[PDB]
Design goal:
The complex is a heterotetramer of chains A (about 200), B (about 220), C (about 210) and D (about 110).
Chain A (H helix, E strand, L loop, with lengths): L2 E4 L10 E5 L9 E7 L4 E7 L5 E3 L8 E5 L4 E5 L10 E7 L2 E3 L2 E4 L11 E2 L18 E3 L5 E4 L9 E2 L3 E2 L5 E2 L2 E2 L13 E5 L4 E3 L1
Antiparallel strand pairs in A: 1-2, 2-7, 3-4, 3-8, 4-5, 6-7, 8-11, 9-10, 12-16, 13-18, 14-17, 15-16, 18-19
Chain B lengths: L4 E4 L2 E4 L17 E7 L9 H4 L3 E4 L6 E3 L2 E3 L3 E5 L25 E5 L9 E4 L4 E3 L3 E3 L9 E9 L7 E8 L7 E4 L5 E4 L6 H11 L7 E3 L5
Parallel strand pairs in B: 1-12, 3-6, 7-8, 8-13, 15-16
Antiparallel strand pairs in B: 1-2, 3-12, 4-9, 5-11, 10-11, 10-12, 13-14, 14-15
Chain C lengths: L3 E4 L2 E5 L4 E11 L3 E6 L6 E5 L3 E2 L7 E14 L9 E6 L11 E6 L6 E5 L3 H5 L4 E9 L4 E7 L2 E3 L3 E2 L12 E8 L3 H4 L4 E7 L5 E3 L5
Parallel strand pairs in C: 2-9
Antiparallel strand pairs in C: 1-3, 3-7, 4-5, 4-8, 5-6, 8-9, 10-11, 11-15, 12-13, 12-16, 14-15, 16-17
The chains are: A mainly beta (about 200), B mainly beta (about 220), C mainly beta (about 210), D alpha+beta (about 110).
Bound molecules: a molecule of 8 linked components (NAG-NAG-BMA-MAN-MAN-MAN-MAN-MAN) and 2-acetamido-2-deoxy-beta-D-glucopyranose (NAG) (2 copies).
Membrane topology (chain B): Peripheral membrane protein
Subcellular location (chain B): Virion membrane; Host cell membrane
Subunit structure (chain B): Interacts with host entry receptor NPC1.
Chain lengths: ~200, ~220, ~210, ~110
């Protein structure tokens, strides 16, 4: 049913991103597309689940390759194009079209389910660990960062601010939550997980 | 007699012996398709206590089977292994060619005993028991099936499931006592207020050693 | 190849108003279109398919009609959770073309920014680079003016401003102005103030001594 | 004639399963010894409720059940398959059962030339 994605990438390198399809067989009458959105949406390519008919975008003639795998039920995408403008967020999603029990009226309908999300930063900068109280998470690279309060049990009132890139290149944000003044001192702790560097902070 | 549905460019319409026009064109038998749809899409009750209320035994009626080429993915299927209290079976063995329903998510494997005042078990509401591309009117012993109906149309580390074992007492009667068999020595009671995902969370904590058979009862909040 | 443009780029409306988004096409298209919604910090969702049908799990207030070259999406009785970017989509042609996502903004009565100040931490000052945080929460509109007063000195160039999007439930902004400097220029001063100039009585200033 | 969804609920999305009669995979894939098992012969698919089709479909099967049930009680075939081929021939008979001409609605000929 739902889709999850896996994925910094050095220049001229192949950004290997896989789109694993959970809760459903990958081999079917559906299509599978790749979508991205540069900061300030765009269709990348389409691969037919059945018969392996891969179709791409004119602007990406010799710069995109989409492969499928039925064993692991995943879909990989390699980007050898060192365009340096592809530093955006990517997504994968299916579109069942209008398939009346094999009879394919049109194989391009609304994309029903999408992926969880995957951020890519095409840049030449070594990945540096984060640094977390007030809790402010600053001096980290690359983005993004997931901050959870009380292991996710605290969601109301919490409002994390966007990440601003310092002059030193390292990003910096702030995460502050409003709690009753009577509860201050009676516990609380911010839980952070930086998957790019694989460094948990509590 | 039997109505067919010809899909016309947006949706379907019924046209049969009385209704025919030159606009429709059937150039090959591939356009004809018999579709088997599950009863889940109609909003019927899916738990074991209510599903068994729609089945009953009856003698003197010859069973009949019909083919359906394509079917819908079923979430809750049923597999009965009922035997009479003396020890004899109640349902007939699945004949050759008939196999369990292909796509199921929660296969409710009921294993109990009942009076079985009849030869075959039919559907009280008239729905069919869906099997592997075969829609029958009875229940076959130890054979996974799904309730549903059939139509006829004219057209222009992998994915798996999980079975659920049960222990019934007095199957097919107004007085029936169902039991969830989490383990051979640890079983819990059931009711219509239990969802398939809830039972999946039971083993998640039931942990399936001289306590013997233990009957349990849940009182959630 | 086939081009489609969604207009207007910017759009602001109050809760309860009816929004109308248009998406023209360069080439003719059949009754096959789609509309998508993408809330901030969330993956996109399917809102409409085939230009007329609602997706699974969509409230019955996203009305979409049109055919041929000009299509239209209508949101009756806009709500606060509808704050998102809405894009266009093509069908029955290649390549699959999108449109310029129309960013939706919500209108709310002027709110008072709850100003807070957080002096640096003992761990944040041990490395040698202390940082002060001045939080503004639940104010509308986003127009604000936050300045730092470090012992009467107007701090400039060393602050990092960051405004968030309108909250999905509160429909309001939140500003986090952070002043980052070295420990050398930090210990040389005692009081760290932060004044806020907002439309909604007088500039509020929050200070903090050595403590 | 149209169809009205009289069922209590309707699942607009129809996750279906069917067989690919032309899943060739030229080489050695169609051999029963080397082919799939009884479980991997299907190919799934999804059908959105476009223009009330899926809800209008779940009612057609609930209504076909009556006429289909009487048809099964009549025949003695333990397994009935000719139902599809029955309507296939009746369609030809309805249009070519007797004589024909371009004179009325019984026959379908349009010789404009
Ligand atoms: C095609 O689709 C239609 C539409 O769904 C199907 O119609 C259904 O046909 C069956 C056939 O038997 C009927 O069974 C009888 O149902 C009544 C209950 O009906 C009331 O409740 C309905 C459901 O509400 C509950 O259940 C659902 C799902 O489980 C839940 O979601 C709900 O929350 C509830 O818990 C409800 O739909 C009915 O609606 C009424 O109003 C609408 C219009 O608003 C009408 O269309 C309906 O027809 C109806 O008037 C209604 O509120 C049971 O009480 C019956 O039980 C006994 O009596 C039956 C009739 O005699 C008998 O057949 C049973 O065997 C049973 O016998 C009992 O009584 C006997 C004495 O009379 C005793 O001798 C015996 O021992 C026993 O005690 C029965 O189960 C459905 O009601 C009917 N539903 C509808 C909506 O029409 C149709 O079946 C489908 N076709 C096929 C082939 O599947
Ligand atoms: C759908 O049917 C209408 C009926 O007039 C027709 O005009 C239209 O072209 C059809 N759509 C197709 C054939 O794609
Ligand atoms: C049930 O839970 C136990 C945990 O003790 C586990 O060993 C077993 O595999 C589980 N079985 C199922 C069917 O979930």
């Amino acid at each position: 049913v739902q889709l999850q994605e896996w994925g910094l990438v050095k220049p001229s390198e192949t950004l290997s991103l896989t789109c694993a399809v959970y809760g459903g067989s990958i081999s079917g009458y559906y299509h599978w597309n790749w979508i991205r959105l540069p900061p300030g949406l765009e269709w990348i390519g389409n691969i037919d689940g059945n018969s392996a008919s891969t179709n791409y975008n004119p602007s990406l003639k010799t710069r995109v390759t989409i492969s499928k795998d039925t064993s692991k039920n995943q879909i990989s995408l390699k980007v050898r194009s060192l365009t340096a403008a592809d530093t955006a967020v990517y997504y994968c999603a299916r579109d069942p079209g209008f398939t009346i029990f094999g009879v394919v009226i049109t194989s391009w309908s609304g994309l029903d389910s999408w992926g969880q999300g995957a951020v890519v930063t095409v840049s030449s900068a070594s990945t540096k660990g984060p640094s977390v109280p007030l809790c402010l998470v600053k001096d980290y690279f690359p983005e993004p960062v997931t901050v959870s309060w009380n292991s996710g049990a605290l969601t109301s009132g919490v409002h994390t601010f966007p990440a601003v890139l310092q002059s030193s290149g390292l990003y910096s944000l702030s995460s502050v939550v409003t709690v009753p003044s009577s509860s201050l001192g009676t516990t609380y702790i911010c839980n952070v997980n930086h998957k790019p560097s694989n460094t948990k902070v509590d | 007699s039997i109505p067919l549905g010809v899909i016309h460019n947006s949706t379907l319409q019924v046209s049969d012996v009385d209704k025919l026009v030159c606009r429709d064109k059937l150039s090959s038998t591939n356009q004809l398709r018999s579709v088997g749809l599950n009863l889940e899409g109609n909003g019927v009750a899916t738990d074991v206590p209510s599903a068994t209320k729609r089945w009953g035994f009856r003698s003197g009626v010859p069973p009949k089977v019909v083919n359906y080429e394509a079917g819908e993915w079923a979430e809750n299927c049923y597999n009965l292994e009922i035997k009479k209290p003396d020890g004899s079976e109640c349902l007939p063995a699945a004949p050759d060619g008939i196999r369990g329903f292909p796509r199921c998510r929660y296969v409710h494997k009921v294993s109990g005993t009942g009076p079985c005042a009849g030869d075959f078990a039919f559907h009280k509401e008239g729905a069919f028991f869906l099997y592997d591309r075969l829609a029958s009117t009875v229940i076959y012993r130890g054979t996974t099936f799904a309730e549903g109906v059939v139509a006829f149309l004219i057209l222009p580390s992998g994915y798996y499931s999980t079975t659920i074992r049960y222990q019934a007492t007095g199957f097919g009667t107004n007085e029936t006592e169902y039991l969830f068999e989490v383990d051979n020595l640890t079983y819990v009671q059931l009711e219509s207020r239990f969802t398939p995902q809830f039972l999946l969370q039971l083993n998640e904590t039931i942990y399936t050693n001289t306590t013997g058979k233990l009957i349990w009862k849940v009182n959630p909040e | 190849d086939i081009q489609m443009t969604q207009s207007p780029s910017s759009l602001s409306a109050s809760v309860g108003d009816t929004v109308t988004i248009t998406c023209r096409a360069s080439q003719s298209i059949s009754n096959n279109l789609a509309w998508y919604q993408q809330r901030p910090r969330r993956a996109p969702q399917l809102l409409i398919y085939a230009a007329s049908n609602l997706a699974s799990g969509v409230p019955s207030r996203f009305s979409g009609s049109g055919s041929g070259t000009d299509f239209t999406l209508t949101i009756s009785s806009l709500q606060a959770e509808d704050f998102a970017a809405y894009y266009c989509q093509q069908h029955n042609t290649l390549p699959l073309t999108f449109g310029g996502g129309t960013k939706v903004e919500i209108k709310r009565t002027v709110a008072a920014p709850s100003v807070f100040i957080f002096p640096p931490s003992d761990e944040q000052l041990k490395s040698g680079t202390a940082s002060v945080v001045c939080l503004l929460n639940n104010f509308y509109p986003r127009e604000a003016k936050v300045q730092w007063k470090v012992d009467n000195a107007l701090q400039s160039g060393n602050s990092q401003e960051s405004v968030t999007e309108q909250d999905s439930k509160d429909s309001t902004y939140s500003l986090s102005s952070t002043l980052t400097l070295s420990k050398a220029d930090y210990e040389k001063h005692k009081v760290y103030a932060c004044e806020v100039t907002h439309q909604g009585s007088s500039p509020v200033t929050k200070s903090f001594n050595r403590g | 004639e149209a169809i009205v969804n009289a069922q209590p609920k309707c699942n607009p999305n129809l996750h279906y399963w069917t067989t690919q009669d032309e899943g060739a995979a030229i080489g050695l894939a169609w051999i029963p010894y080397f082919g799939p098992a009884a479980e991997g012969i299907y190919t799934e698919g999804l059908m959105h409720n476009q223009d009330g089709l899926i809800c209008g479909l779940r009612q057609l099967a609930n209504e076909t059940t009556q006429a289909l049930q009487l048809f099964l009680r009549a025949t003695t075939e333990l397994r009935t398959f000719s139902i599809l081929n029955r309507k296939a021939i009746d369609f030809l008979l309805q249009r070519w059962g007797g004589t024909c001409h371009i004179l009325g609605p019984d026959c379908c000929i349009e010789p404009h030339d």
